[model samples]
Target: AGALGDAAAAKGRYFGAAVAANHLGEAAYASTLDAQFGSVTPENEMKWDAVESSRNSFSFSAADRIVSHAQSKGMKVRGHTLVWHSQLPGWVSPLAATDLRSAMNNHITQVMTHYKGKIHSWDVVNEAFQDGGSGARRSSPFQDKLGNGFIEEAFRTARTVDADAKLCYNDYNTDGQNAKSNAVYEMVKDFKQRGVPIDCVGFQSHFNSNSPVPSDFQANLQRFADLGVDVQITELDIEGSGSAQAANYTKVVNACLAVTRCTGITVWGVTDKYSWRSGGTPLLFDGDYNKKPAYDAVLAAL
Candidate 1:
C-alpha cells in the first residue's frame, strides 16, 4: 500500500539504506532514500579511513552532513563502524602494541560521543570473527595487537560514551549457524553473561542466488533473541537473475517478519549504480532509479 518504509513501519520495524555521502544531494538518490526508508547509515563516511585518516586528525564533516540530513528528515541513523580490520588509515596499523588500545579508545569516544544523541545505533565492533577454522579473530591490526580484547574494549568504550545508543556487533556470513556465526554467537553469549555492554547483533546478509542464503537463518535470529539481544538484518543485497533474486529477497524479508526479535532491515544501497555490487545489479532499484520486481515481492512478504 506504500513505500518500503510504510510497510515496515506498519509492522513496527524500520526500513533503511546504506547511503554514501558523496551521493547525497542528487535529485533521484536524495528523494528515493528519504521516501522509501525510515533510516540511513552512511556507507563509508563514518569508517576509520574516512573519519580519522591520520593520527589524531579527525574529520567529521562528511559524516556530519549525513547525520544532519537524517535528523532533518525524521529518520534514524546508524553509525556504521567504530572498529574494523579493513579501511584502516596508514598511521593506525604500524603503531606500537602499547599505543593501540588508547588509539582505539580515542576513536570510539570521539565518534560515538560526537553523534551521541543523534543516532539510533552504532556498529561498535564489526567483522571480528574469522570465517574459517575455529572462528578466531579476523586478521586486523586490532587482532594482531589486542586479540579478542579489542572487541570487548570497543563495546565497553562505546557504552561509556553513548549509553543511549544501541551498541551492536556487526558481521557478515553470520546470518546462520556456521563457523563464523558460532564464533560470534558464543562471543555475544559471553558478553551477555559478563556484562560487556553490547546491545544487538547485525547480520550483513550479503548473499547471492548461487552462493545461497543461510539454511537456518530464522533459528539463528531466534537463538540470538533468546540470548536477550536484538537482531538486525543489516546490509542486505541479493545478486542474480530477476526471479531468483526476487525469491531470495522475498525469503529474507519473510524470515525477518517471522522472527519476533528481528528489528529491521537495511538494503545495501538505494540503487544499483551506488551498490557495493556496482559491477552487477544487486538492489531493488535499477540504474534508471526504477523499482525492480524484488521491491514488490518484499513488500508483499512484509
Candidate 2:
C-alpha cells in the first residue's frame, strides 16, 4: 500500500482513482485502488451505454457492483454521467424528437434515483461541448433534439432525484488555458449568472509530457472559484516520466491548492495498463503496480 491516500487526507483533500467494472475482481488492481485512493469513480459502468442500452429497459447489474464495492470499502463514489453523446446505444438515434427528451429525462431520474445517496457527485453532463475544443455545442443528437437548454434540463432532473449529489460539468481539454477551456469557462459563467444547478466545474487534465504545463493554470482555477463554484481536477493523468510526469504532478497539485475552492484531484485510473492513453505513461502506478515517481511527487505536493 502507498501513502498517497493518507498523505492527501493529512492535507484535508481527497485523492481519487477511477475503476473499471470489468476489473472489479482482480485482487492486484483492486488492492491498489483500495489502498491508495479515498474516492472511486466507475470508469464506464455508469455511462449511458452500460446502464440503458436497450431502449427504456435499464439494468444496474454491472454498475451496481462497482458502486456497492466502493461503498463497502468506505470510499465515496462519483456518478460518472447523466448525459453525454458518446457510448450512445443504437436506440437513442432512432427515437422521434419528442420521445427522446422523455427518454433522456427518464434515464436521469432512474439512474440518479438508483444511486442517489451513494455517490459524492455526478458528472451530470460529460464532454457536451463541441469537439475540437470549440465553444459551439457538439452536433450531438441531444443538442439537435433538445437544444442548449438540455444541459440545464439534465441538471434540473438530476437535482430532483438527488438534491444532495454535487452536479458537475465534466469534460476534457478544459484544464489549461486554451480555446476549449475558454469556452467551458464562458459556459460555466453563463450557468452561474442564470442560477443553473451547477455546483462545480471539472478539468479533465489529460495532459501529456510533450507540452508545457500552463503558466496560468492556477489563475484559471481561481477565476472559476471566484464564480462561486467548486473546482476539481476530475480525470488527471500526465503522460510521461521520471522527471517529466512527476514534475507535472507537482505542478497540477500545487495549482489545485492555490485555489481555495478547488476541492480535490482524481487520477483517471490507478495504473497505466488500464489508462485510456494507451502507450502513453499517464498514471502514478506502472503495470507491475509499482508506484512511480509521479506518486511520490503528488504525495509531497499535497
Candidate 3:
C-alpha cells in the first residue's frame, strides 16, 4: 500500500538503492529516493580509489555528501566496500607485503572510524571469488601479497572500529547454489566456525537474459543464513522490461521475503538512466524518473 521502503519496513526489512552523489542534485532523483528507499549505498564514493587514492592520505568530501543526504532522508547507510580488487588505486599494487598489510589495516580502521555510528553495514570484502564457476579465489594484490588471510584481517580491523555495523563479504554471480557460491559458503562456514567477525554476505544479483533469477535463490540464502549470518541482495539490476521484468522483480522480492535472515535489498541505481550498466533498462525507474512496471511489481511484492 505504501512505497517500497514503507512496505518493507512494515515487514521488518529495508528497501535500498545504490546512489551516486552527483545525481543527488536532481529534484526527481532526490524526491523518488526519499520516498521509496529506507537505505542508501554510495555507488562509488565509498570505494577505495574514491576515498583514499594515496598512501596514508584520505578524502571523504564526496562520500560525505551522499551520507549526509541519506541521513537527512532517514535512510540507513550501507558502506559499499572497504576492500576490493577492481577499484583499488595503483599505489597499492607496488607496496611490499608488510607495508601492504599495514596499509590495508589502516584503511579499514580509518574508514570505519569515520562513519562508525552512521553506517548500518559494511561490505568488508568484495568480489574475492572468481567468476565463470571456477570456485577459485580471485587473484589480486590483497590475495597475492597478503594471501587468503587478508579478508579475515580486514574484517578483524573493521570490527575493532565499529562492532555494531554488519560486516559483509560481497560478490557477483554467486546468487544460486553453484560452484562460486559453494566456495563462498565454505569460507563463511569457516569464518563463523573460527570467529572471523563476519556478519553478512551480499549477493550482487545483476541478472541478464543469460543469467535470470536462479530457481534456488531462496534456498541459497537460507543455507547462508543457517551459518548464522545475514544475507542481502546488494546490487540488484535485472536486465529486461515491461511485464517480463516485473515478473523477475517479484521473484527476487519473494525470495528475500521468504528468508528471515535476509536483512534487506538494494537496487543498483535510482533510475535506469544512470545505471552503470547504462545502455539497458535495468532498474525500477525509467529514464524520465517515471515508475516502471518493475517498480510496481517490487512494491506489490514488498
Candidate 4:
C-alpha cells in the first residue's frame, strides 16, 4: 500500500488533512500528517480572530509557523478563510456599514498579500448563506451592511492581491442537494455568468447524525464543476464507527473521483483524538496515529 499523497497524485488529485499548530510539536502527529497527506489547512491559525484580533493590527505568528512547516515538507497549503461570521473579532460587529466594508476588504488584502503565491486556495467567504428557511443570506455584519454583494467584493479584492491563488467560497451543510446547496449553487452560477473571479467552491463535508452523507454527492459536485469552477471536499469528517464509517469514507472519495473538476479532499484533522467533534471519532487515523478502517477505504478509493 502506498501513502495517500502518492495515491491521490497518481489520480491527479490531492489528499489533505487539517492541522493545528500545537499538534505539529507532537512527533507522532507531525510524522503521520507529513507521511500521508500532500496538502494541509491550518485549522484555526488563519481565521480572522486568530490573526487580526484588533482593528488595523494583524499577526501571523501561528499561521506562518504552519505555512512554513507545510512548505518545508513539500505540502500545499489551503488558507482556511479570509471572511467568516464566526471567529471574528469583537470590534467587527459594532462598526457602521462603511467602516465594516473597509475593514473587511483591508483584512483580505493584507492576509492575501502576506501569503501571496504560497497558498493554493483561500476560502474568501465562508458560510454566508442560511442553512434553510427560504434560502436567505445569513445575517452578519457583511450581509446586513454590505448586502449580499460582500461575497463578490471579497473575491474581487482577493484577486487583485494574489492573482495566482484560487479564491473559494466555503460553506457547510451544502454537501448535499438541499435548499442551502441550491442557494450557493445559484450564487456560483451568477458569479460564473458575471465573471466574479471565483475560482472554486468548498463543501465543508462535516457529516454527522443530523446530516448524513448525501447519496447524490457525486452529482452535486458535478453540477458545481459544470459551472466551470473547481469543487473541493474541504473539512470532511464522517460520523460512525467500524465498517459503516469506512463505507462512508469510500462513498466520499469515490464521489470526488467521479468528478473531473473535483480537485482534492481535506479530512478535518490528523487524528480522531484531536478532531473538533469530540467523542465522534470522525477522522481517518486512530488516537495512536494508526490508520483506521476509514483510512484504508479512502486509500483504496483513490
RMSD of each: 1.5, 1.7, 1.2, 1.2
Poorly placed runs, candidate 4 (over 4 Å): none
Candidate 4, residues 1-302: lDDT per residue as tens digits?
12897799898989899999988999999889988999999999999998899888889999999999988988889998998988788899999999999999999999888899999989999999887657899989899999989999999999999999989999999987889999999999999999999999999999998899888989999999999999999999988789999999999999999999999999999999999885999999998999899998998898
Query: What residue pairs clash in candidate 4, if any at all?
Result: none
Question: Model 3 — TM-score against the truth?
Answer: 0.98
- TM-score of decoy 1: 0.97
TM values, all candidates = 0.97, 0.95, 0.98, 0.98
Poorly placed runs, candidate 2 (over 4 Å): 131-133, 209-212
lDDT computed for candidate 1: 0.87
Query: Which pairs in model 2 have colliding backbones?
Result: none
Candidate 1 lDDT score at position 144:
89
Candidate 1 per-residue lDDT, tens place, 1-302, comes to 12787789899888999989898989998888877888898999999999889878889999999999888888889998999888898888898777999999999998887898998889988888877667887788899888768888888888889878998999998877888888888988999999889889999999974447877888888899888888999899988758878888988998898888788999999999888787768899888888898887887887
Error of 2 at 97 (Å): 2.3
Clashes of each: 0, 0, 0, 0
**Candidate 3: stretches off by over 4 Å:** none
The sequence of per-residue lDDT tens digits that candidate 3 reaches over residues 105-159 is 9999899888979999999999998888689999999999999899999998899
